[PDB]
Amino acid sequence: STMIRRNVPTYTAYASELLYKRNLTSLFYNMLRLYYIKKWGSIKYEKDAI
Amino acid sequence: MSSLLNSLLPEYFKPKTNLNINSSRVQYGFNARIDMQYEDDSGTRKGSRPNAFMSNTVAFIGNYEGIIVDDIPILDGLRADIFDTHGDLDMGLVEDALSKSTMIRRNVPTYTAYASELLYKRNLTSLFYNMLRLYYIKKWGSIKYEKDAIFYDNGHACLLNRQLFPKSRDASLESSLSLPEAEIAMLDPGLEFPEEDVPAILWHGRVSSRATCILGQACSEFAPLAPFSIAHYSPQLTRKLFVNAPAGIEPSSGRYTHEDVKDAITILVSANQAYTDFEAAYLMLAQTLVSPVPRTAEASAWFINAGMVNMPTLSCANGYYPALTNVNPYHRLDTWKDTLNHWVAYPDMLFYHSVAMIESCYVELGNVARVSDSDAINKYTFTELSVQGRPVMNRGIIVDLTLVAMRTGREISLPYPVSCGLTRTDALLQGTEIHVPVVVKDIDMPQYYNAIDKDVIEGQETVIKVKQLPPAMYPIYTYGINTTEFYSDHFEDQVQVEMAPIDNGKAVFNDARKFSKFMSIMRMMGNDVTATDLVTGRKVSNWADNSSGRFLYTDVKYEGQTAFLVDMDTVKARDHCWVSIVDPNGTMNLSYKMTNFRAAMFSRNKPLYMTGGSVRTIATGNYRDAAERLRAMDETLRLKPFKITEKLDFRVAAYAIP
Amino acid sequence: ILWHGRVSSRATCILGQACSEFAPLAPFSIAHYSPQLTRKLFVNAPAGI
Amino acid sequence: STMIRRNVPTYTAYASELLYKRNLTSLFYNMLRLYYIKKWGSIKYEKDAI
Incomplete structure (x- = not known):
């Protein structure tokens, strides 16, 4: 090719050393967290609550 | 591949050789006889x-x-x-x-x-591609491009050439490019070590004075002024080009005709034995010869950002190894010379093969854009499942050939998995809003189009927000061969709108499918219907096109709940050769029938006629039977006599055969 | 020795250091004392080193 | 040839002498040591250690 x-x-x-460590799970994890912070971004945490 | 692009053409279409193009716009289509009928409780009204x-x-x-x-x-x-x-x-x-x-x-x-590296540098596709473009630039050189011209106009919205193509000066196609010539040096056979990163080609006999000028301009930067399709921007292929010709290279002439470029190609393919390289270059140009004028105003989203053309790097090491090329070459398929032989005979046939390919692609990308991402075969993963080879990257010709396979419903086979040419699926895969510019004509525009402003005075430059891409072309050559219910390209069709006399003309279409067929058939009958959505409060008009004369559901410009109120006492007769709906009562039944088909082409609001000889289906057998024949008549001048015969007059002589 | 195509810029540095004296400071197992293998090393590569 | x-x-x-000089074990040995020196290069040795 x-x-x-x-x-x-x-x-x-170089390919032989890199192929045995390929993982994009940590990148998608943070991208998913950014989706839900923007969507449900009006939830209030009060310190002196029960 | 001439063979697969030939099968796309209709059965009734009988093409001729010459096509005298004298403009930058062509309306290809067909003439058909439509027998429309309107049945009702009162009676039937027939049209034709x-x-x-x-x-x-x-x-x-x-x-x-x-x-x-x-x-x-x-x-x-x-x-x-x-x-x-x-x-x-x-x-x-x-x-x-x-x-x-x-x-x-x-x-x-x-x-x-050196052989280990240099023998695997064999790709002449980039050179043949540029030399084919030089042929058509000099042939159709008299076509003009005006700066302040109408790209699209539908009455409500107008889109100028200034809007889509800035940095654009008005000029003819011949006067667009000013190509500088690259150096064509002669290869010294007694060179110590071959120079890699400099391609060396073979040649038959002497390089002519005009062949130098053509090869010089082919391996150079294309820097155009006017945005033409066959004169687009291309990088410098190479700086220097060696030519292993024992007979010396003559210096550059300066001028050449379109016939001299055909002479240059036929020598290059024959010497180098590069027929599969030419087949790749033929399919590349078939994509990027002509682009479609958008059907609707909001179908200009496809042509906003420039689609990238993938030209493979020019690399050839035949000049250094003359011994390895001979009269007994290695080929995979037996029909490997068919594509060149077709082009040499009928050069102007490429125009018909080009429109056949873009019409096949843009029709299928129409009904691919209307599938949800949550599915097996979707927007992103329709190329991977179809391809059963090993290409480097799913781009260029692979994406265009797989769309043609879906349209016709057949298996397309190429000898090499080459990935070069234009990539169309760019605006689709992005999956974002596109902002197309528009200049307004009327003041009541932003009710119909999803405009950015709600009140706009005439002659103002506004922006339309296009979310879902509507179909850019309607199926015409591929009409009723692989029919879908979206386009509704049937020969026979009918719709039944159910109304009671208690209702004073007003009908609500709960179903979306039969609303599309009602609005479409009413336009064939020459009636201007204007429906209004009950939920949102927008309006749709069946007259949203001046080419096909059909209503697709994507003309609503909104995906929501279906509640279309149509008032049937505000229907206006617009066109000629029309059936009248004066005052309907009870159930309506509309129907049509298309009987015969005749190929027609228009240019500059005048008929464009095909001239020259009758084009045939060239096969590999048709030439090599004459090679089997060899003209085996022994080349011996056998002169046969004529016996004179005397009759009544005797003054005049008369010769007989025996 | 023989070579495939061109001897790269980094291959010269590796072969140069491989055919040399190991004079360590810290007593490591993979960096023990070794004599000079050779002074000069020819490479039959038509493509220049 | x-x-x-x-x-x-x-x-x-010359063939009688030179063709029986075939032993590249010393070169491969040193090149293998250079691989592991650059890979595990961050390991330390203290003088006054146990």
Whole structure:
């Protein structure tokens, strides 16, 4: 899947180290929290409540 | 691929060779005979339009921008000996082939080492693409673009060419581009080590004075003034280009005709054995030759931001290895020369193949935009499930060919999974509001269109908020081959609106489906109906187009609950050849029938006629049967005699055959 | 030694340090004392180093 | 082969000695040590430690 075949040995070496640590779960977690902060963003917390 | 784009054309359509285009706007369509009928408790009222013209306006303008991307190598052309059983370059047979050749003996060891990198640089698609554009620039060079011209107008809203295309000066297509020439150097056969990042091509005999000027301009930056479709922005392909021609390269002439570009292409494909490269370039240009004029005012959202064209980097290492190309090439499919042979015979047929492809795509993107994200085959994931290959990235031709496969309902097969050309699905995948500019004509505009202002004086520049993208084209060539209920492109159709005499003309359509068919058939009958939504309080008019003459449900410009009040004592007769609804009572039954079809084209409000010879379906067998024949009549001048015959007069002579 | 295509800018630095004396300060197991393997190393690469 | 013709006789004479010099174990050993030095480079050694 390339015409420039000089970079294949270098590309393979870096790919082998990175593929065994791929995880986007933490990014989606924060993106979901930002959705609900904006939607339900009129809830009041009073300190001297029960 | 000439074959698959040919099948898209209708059965009644019989095309000829020459098409004398003399403008930047064409109304392609057909003439049909519509037998309309209105049945009621009182009686039946019959009408008949003998020549009904259903058209789709297509222009030669459209903002595009080229970017140089990395794409797969096309291995068709190289000799079949060096390839192994599986079909990849077995290095070891390459070293064997170079050794037993007419190469300099001191270069064999150093050239063989480079082979591992350079032999996998085979993609001439970018060069053929630019050379095809130069052919059509010089042919249709007299077409004009005016700055303060009408891009769209429907009576209420108007959209000028100044609005969509700023930085735009008025000029002819010939006077648009001023291409500078790249250096065409001669390759020295006795060069020590090959220079990578500089492509070297093959040539038959001597490079002519005009061939230098064409190749020089093809490998250069396109910097246009007027926004033309065949003269869009492209980056510099290369700085220098080597040509392995033992006969010296003549210097640049300066001038050339469109016939000289055909001469340049036919020599380049034959020498390099690059037919699959040409097939890729033919399909690329088929997408980005003509762009559709939008059907409605709010269907201009597709052409606001410039769609990127993916041109694969120019890379060729045939000049350095002349031995590896010969008369016995490796090819996957047997019908691999069919696309070039079709273009050389009928160049002007590309116009018909282009409109067939964009009409197929923009129709399917119409009914793809109306599916919810929560589904299996949706907006984002319709390309992945359809594709059964291994392309680098799902872009360019893959997205356009998969939309054609959905329209026709057939299996499209290409020899190489190449991913180059225009990407259309840009505004769709974003999934945000688009702000199209508009200049107002009347003062009662913002009731109909979802405008930003509620009161606007005439001649003011306003903005319309488009959320869901309406269909840009109506199906005309693909009419009643794969019918859907959205477009309702049937030959026979009927609708039953149920009213009682207690109701004083006023009917409420609870159903959305039959409301669409009622409003559409009433427009065929030449009646101006104006419905009003009860929930929201907006208004819709069936007369929202001057081309097709149909009403799609996306003309409401709002998704909500369906409660359309239509008052049937405010119906106005607008067009000629029309049936009258004077005063209805009881149940109404509307119906029509389309019987025959005749191909028609319009340009500058005049008929555009097809001229020249009768175009045939060129097959691989039709030429190679004459190769099987060889003209085997032994080339021997056999002169047969004529015996003179005497009759009554004797003054005059008469010769007989035996 | 032999090589595929061009010897990269970083490959020169690695081969240069691999064929050299290890003179450590701290007694580490993967950085123990080793003599100079060779002074010069040829590389048959038609594409220049 | 693709060798220079004037070198064939002189190179063939040397073959008897040079072709039996094949041991790259020392080079691979040092290159493997450079891999782990740069990977686990942040480990520390204190002089007055237990």
